[PDB]
Structures are given as C-alpha cells and as structure tokens.
C-alpha cells in the first residue's frame, strides 16, 4: 500500500522529494548481487540516504584455470533503464550506462543468422518458422486465459500436449529461457504475456540487446563505482546466518542480524529505522568448477543463501517456502555450463561457417544461442561480441555452452555432461559443429581451454510453485524488512531476468521509505490490442484471419458474420494494418 | 520516414548522438509561440545546434487597463514532459519545470467541488453524472469506430442526436474543451480516444494539472531563459510576409524569407542547411481589447499569421488550406473572453459560497471552469490558484470568463457578449452567481476591473476539416521546411493543447535533423483493454454488464452465452477487476 504503479514520461522524468525522516535511517543489504546493488543505488539517488549509512554485506572476501562466461536485455526492462540512466559509464565520458548500451546496440544491432542446427552442423530447414498447429496455438492461448491463482504447482507438461512440444516454437522458447518440461506453467504463462510484444523476434533474437562486456564489467563495476563515489560501505567476509524478526499481531520488525564476520560470531542490532534488504535464495550458490581435464564435482550442498532463507521461513510462512525451489530438483535438470576459450583458426573458422560472421571482428557473432536440436544433451551455445573481457587477447574467443539434460549420454562423448571434463564437453560440442572426428580430440584437449561449472540451483527460479511460496517484496505489516531478487514476489514480471532484480529492489526501497514517485508497471503489452493482433498473426506463421479459418466451418462462418459487422469501420482498418485482413 | 515512434523508459531516458553535419546548419523559427520555443529547445538539447545559429523571428517589439488571463495539462502530455524535465525552474533551485509542476500538483491536487450551476447560483442536481442514454453511448462508440478518413468535413451535429446533446456529458465536454456543435467530428473523435484514460475525471476535473502561475511566467519565461543561456537569438519587430519555396518534382526547399524588419523590407536567403520552422495560423491573431467601460471591438482582420499561411498555401496544396480555418467562422462562435479582477469581499465571498474554497488561500479555487448551464451565453468561468501573476496584490483575485455563444442576448444584460463592456460582462456573470440584483451594477462598475478580449480565430483549431487541410509537420520531400503548432498534421494527437505544440516541434526537429532517438507516441490508452473496460463502466454511470443489458433481449442473451464461455477464466477476473462483473 506504500507504492503505486505508473507509466509514461511524467512519472519517468519526475524526481521524488526527499523521503520523510530518511536522515535518521540506515540500510543493510544481504549479498552483493544485482538486486542488492540496485537497491543501494535507489537508496542513494531517490531515498537520498547517506552513503555511510548503507552497508552491503558480502560473504566472500574483497583460482579458476580459464575464463568463465555467465543473459540479455530488451527495450522494456522498464525499471533497469530507470536505474542505469543514472549510473556513469566507465567507457564513455559524460555518458550513462544506458547511453553506452543504447548507442552500442544501434551501432551493432543483435540478430541471429542461424538459430538451430542438426546433423553435425546443418541448419534446421524450417528455422525461422514456429511450426505451431492450431491445437498448439489454442493451448498457448488457453494457458494465458487461465488465472494465475489456478496454476499452483502446475507443470508445463500439464497444460501442453504433443503438437506444442514438437513445434519449433518450443525449441526456440525452452532453450532461450531454459525452461524444462517439469517447470512452472505459472512462470511460462508470465513469460508469454510479459514478452508478447517481441514474438516477431523470437526466432532470430532481433529483440535481444547485450552489454559491451560481461555483466560484471558492464553493469556491476559501474554500479560499484557509483556507490563508492557516494561513500557506500562494502562489507566482505560476512556470512549472514539469520535475522531475528519479531512477527507480532500488528507488525513485522527485524531486530538483529546474526553474522559470522571472518570466523567471529557477531551481531548487528537494528531499530525500526534500520532497513534490511534480503536477497532470498540464489541460483549460483554452491557452484563448483572443473578445468580442461576435470569435471566440475556435482554437489547438493545447501550454502549460506539457502540456509538463511530457511532460517527466515522458520519465523513466518509469509517469508516464503525455499524448499519448493532448492529441494527435489530432478537430476535431468540443467546443472552444467562451460566456457570454451580458443585462438585456434580451425574452430573459429568452423563457427564462422555456421553463424556467417567473423567471431574475431568485435561485433555480433551468433546473436544469441545456437541450439543443437538433435543433441542428446539438448545443448546450445553462444558467442557474444568478442572479446567479452577487456584484458583478453584479441586473437581469442570464448564460447558459452549449456545442456538442458544432465543425465543422458552424449552423442560423441557417451556420458552425461555431469561426468565430463572441460575438454569432453568441448569434444561433444565440436562434434555437433561438424568438425572432422579425427581432429576433435586434439582441438579440444590442446587447442582449447574449457572450464565447466556445476550449479545445483541454476534451474531453481522456475521450479513449480504456489502463490505464497515467494515472499512479497515488503511482507504485510513489515516495518523495516524487504525481500528482493528473483525469489521475491511481485505482479506479472518474469524471473530469471535482470529486470526482476531491479524491479524488486526499486519496489522495496520505495515502499520502505515511502518515496513519492511512481514505479513503472510491467509493460502493458498483453493489454494492448495492437500487440495482440500482431501476436495472432505471428503465432499463425503470418496468416490472415481468412487463411486461419479456411479449414473449419464453425469459425469460417463466425468470421463471415464478424467481417460483415465490422466492414468499413475502424476495426477493419486496424486488422488490415496488422495484416490480419 | 525520418523518425520513429516509441514508448517506455528505454527511449525516454536515452540521449541521441549528435546528428550528422549539424555544425553547418542554422534554424529560423517564425513566431515566438510555444511551438517555436519548444523547437528551439530541442534544437539546442538534442540537435546540439549552436545557439547563435538559431533565430526566433517575432513580429512584435521586445497598454491594457488590467490583468488578462489566457489552459491545463494532464499526466500524458508525453512530449511536453520530455521537454520540461530539461528546462530549469525559475522558482526552485536545482529543479526542472517538471519537478516544480510535479511537486505542486501533488501538494495541491486539482479537483472541482462544483462543476455546473444554474438558477443564479444553485448547483446542478445531477452534477457528477453523465446522464447518457444507451443511444447516446452507442453514438459515442460508433464515432470512434468510424475511420478518420470518413470524417472529412463532418460536423459534430452530423454524428450525434438529441439524447447526447441533452446529456451532462456534453455539458462537461463542450465547455471544458470549447467544442461548438458545428465543429469537427474528426477532432471530437480524436479527443474521445486521446483522453479515454481520464473519463473518470471528466466531471470533477481530477485529471487536470496546472502550473503555479500563468503560462507566460511558468512555461515561456523558463524556456526563454534556457534559450538565452545557450546564446539563442531573438529577433523582434520582424514580420514574415512570405517564404519563397522551390516545389520541384523531387524536392521542397525553402529559398528565402521575405520580411519587414522595422518598416524595412529585407530578405533572408537560405541554403539547404538553413532550416525553417513555420507556425502556420494562429488562434490569437487579430485580438482586440476593451476595458471596464468599453467592449473589445469586433474584427475580421486577417493578420500576419494568416496572410503568411495563405502565401505558403499558394505554393503547394501540400502546405494546407488556411481558408478552412480562418474563413466562414459562424457569428455564434466563441469570440470574447474576459478577465475580472477584484479585491471586493462580497464578490469573493459569493465565489467561496459556490466553489467551497477560499479564493485568496493560494490553493485550488474552482479547480477548473464552473459552467452556468442555463446562461443564454453558455458562459463558464474559472479561478486558478491565486494570484496568477507574481506581482499582483495578495488581496486580489482574477476570474477568467468565456461565452460559447456570441450572438444571443444575455439574461441580465440583454445584449450579445460582443456588444458588452468589461463591466457588462461582469454584471451578467455576477447575476448568474446569485448576487443580489440591487448590488450587481456597483460591484461590477466600481468594485471590479474587467478586461474583455475579442479573438476572431479563437475557435479556429476546431473548424470542420478534411485530410490535407493541415500540412504534415515535414511535407513530402521537404529538405529544410517544417510546419509546427496546432494547425500542422500528425497522427491521433489533439489540437488546442500545449502537448500538440511540443509534439509537432519535436517531430519537426527530429525529422529535419534525422535525430536517432524515438519520439513518444500519443499515449496508447485507446488500445489498452483495461482502459477500455474502465470507459464502458464510466460511460454507463457505473453499471456492470448485467445492469447495462438488463432491459434488452438480444444483448441479455449474448451476455449469458459470453459469461458461460468466460466463466472461471482470466477474462472474467479482468472484468471483475474493472467492475464490469
Ligand atoms: K517512474
Ligand atoms: K523518446
């Protein structure tokens, strides 16, 4: 009740008055992920909180055998662009991160010239088409017409049938977003509605936008410099074990942060004027690393992030249900990603022959993942603009590889990916590029350096869930406690996105400080009739309403009577404008 | 083809690169109205044109007997807020005009406590309700469903019948926007679609927002100071008589500006790199002024603005058809407005008794016009926050009065308003406030000072028109010539608004300089299903779909079958959210 949603330039460009009594308030942010950093930025810029009163608590201190790549953006990351228009670029003078990003993606717009391959390097013949049947389209629409409240614990396989899963649409969708068939239909529905304005860019990634470098260099480092320039305090080697919260009949008040500061057990006592921002849960927690000759050791370890959320959930069911997300994760789930770095011309030339661009040119390369449709692992890989690390040699590329299925033997390396060294993952990948099999072993072992990473929780955002499993950003009656990040709850936005991190941060800061400025709503595209007309046209692989209805009597007649009632009206002009007539 | 429309924060917050070759370009803006000033501001900020190369050409030089008041804003003036977030306030340090305006309208939000009066000072009993019948509602919707291309030269009386014109809706609508029954149905349609998101605020003005002072002090003066601080050149006593334009088979190029600079006939020769921004036509041209004892003398004079547009239209029909707007204006049209200033407690107390607020308190007073429904003149009046001039005595108010009908005897002063002195207009107004008739003459003649103004073209924006009567902002193949202001043509936006002035200015500058940043589209509210649901609910005076259909078989049955097919779905939840179920 302490915020309101808005849209349009009035609320975008307006500045909030300094919030009431902020001069006597402090902030503690648990973890240094994007959501914590964003919340600190809003605390500085819009809360006008004093930097020395803002404390970022990081578990790690202030050696992997190679480069490791970790996601993209779209124009309607409304909250994220509100943030980064205020963060100075570290690459361009007198320019924001938004400016640098905006100009770069106009100079070198992202698109894919090859989205799906099969048969050891051949482009899928129907690449670019959705190959959705009428039944599959109806299931998509029926899911969207289902209330979110009726999708508690429903799996994607509960709402779609064979036609949909055989479609190219599902190939594009599951791989670009990392949906597994057992994942949350509720989240899949949110994604369908959230990105409906970009349906025309699904097959070719033409709606995706990327930073110049990896996320740490292009997003985190600029935020850090901004926060440091305003005196914000960074606390390393601090493990938050619990937060004692009073949950009374009238209020929720965080009372004390129980920490281990460099082996020493200490405690931070809080008043109502000391705000606590918890990033509950983590998809990168407990990650392990291999090298070119060693697999990343599988693990089920619960780290500090999941232990902390469990300790908060013990104090109120309003603080969420972490076990839905970190327990009972199927062993087929995506766990392993790998970064394969090479300067070898044979590999780089093979990539060029598939993606149609020079990987070393410094512009778009694959334009997003290429999916190997017939790979047992259901592997995809991408090469961003190179190099993605500013100190990497200019003759090197780093390729990011991931597998949706973790418990199935590969086609060339006949083992599950979880049993594979870096070079074995690279060999399986090189096989599917069409590299001659008598060269694969040496090119992977001696011409490349591949670092695998095992992430027990990388699919955790998407686990089947029920309303209530995620805490509200500001739980009911909370006075000084907020939850931020991709396991907190807010309307219609989609998790596994950087936008969701910034949105929850902004909503938390605005609500706890009662900031008198609107939060931009999730973009209104699923309510926009023009966008919905485009979606019907795109989903039906570019067929007008007559062609859609051509083989059915019940519809071909309803359409005849509809066209007779709209003839010569604005509705007919709109349908013609959007190619439905 | 030299611009694109956008929405959302990405394009709002992004800055355009410096446009190509702007260092060798100059700009001439004809007139110093809002559109010219806005275009100069965009030339500085986004064109990065040198201030000394920007020339504002004003006909007047660098004595009325009293104060003269001249409109409001809404949140979705998308282009105007893009502009004024960059203009420094002259009232608050380190703040924009947008900030000052945003904070003021949150501190003192606008609303009316009395919108319509009758019978010499009594509130209309049904004030607040639209009193629209089903037939009237159907005509509203049928107009919106008509293509704009089918409304050439159609009058409002061609598309509405008796029920609509007897509605409270039409009272609110015609007076707040100054529509006459013979005005353009095309523009009325644009207004219905343009402001559909504010239908719930039509009766009480709760969607209106106002500057602190009159428009000159709160909008023009800040822009002027901004332009002067950047070296922009202001040219006074310059009358533009013509612009010689080459209209070839391949290009339109302005060649020379023919001027009279202080009685001297001179000429400004232009290259392709010299841009010309013409504000074609004017609603204030040829205005005459009276005083407390003298009517403003009626006139049909064509001034420099209308002569110039006629001289441009002689060179291409693509430059518009001014005669549609400045000729054959019916003599019943609104011509006269008056500003009545008083410090008299009897008058001020009578106003307080009607509007329910202290006129001298410095906050909202009437919250917008009060309409005298049974006045022969169809008179309305408003009192903004006082005082509206920063050097006015603190015990004074200034009331703005206007009459939609100019050729009908008044109820107390039995003469058309065009024959009335300032004090006679005030007397007619005081009669309709319920002032005792034995006091009206002395309170108007000796306790008030009323300045009338006769404006032959004040209704000119709304004259019946056809596609093509207004020039495109940048006509086809124009290299260096643009048209801006409320007689230029752009999609869906509404004239008689300051937003239209800023929009045309922005579109002209962006197109002529090929600026690489989106222009915000007219707000998408008529395509937003949520907004349309609200509109149905509001237009039907807050009745759900069952009550709307209760007295009809064809609809009450179609609704039964519709409800049976949407039961338990998201569509039903949406309808319930918006009170239609
Ligand atoms: K905002
Ligand atoms: K924009």
Residue numbers in the entry:
A (entry chain B), B (entry chain B): -1 to 60, 71 to 78, 81 to 591
What do the authors report?
Flavin adenine dinucleotide (FAD)-dependent bacterial oleate hydratases (OhyAs) catalyze the addition of water to isolated fatty acid carbon–carbon double bonds. Staphylococcus aureus uses OhyA to counteract the host innate immune response by inactivating antimicrobial unsaturated fatty acids. In this study, we deduced the catalytic mechanism of OhyA from multiple structures of S. aureus OhyA in binary and ternary complexes with combinations of ligands along with biochemical analyses of relevant mutants. We conclude that OhyA accelerates acid-catalyzed alkene hydration by positioning the fatty acid double bond to attack the active site hydronium ion, followed by the addition of water to the transient carbocation intermediate.
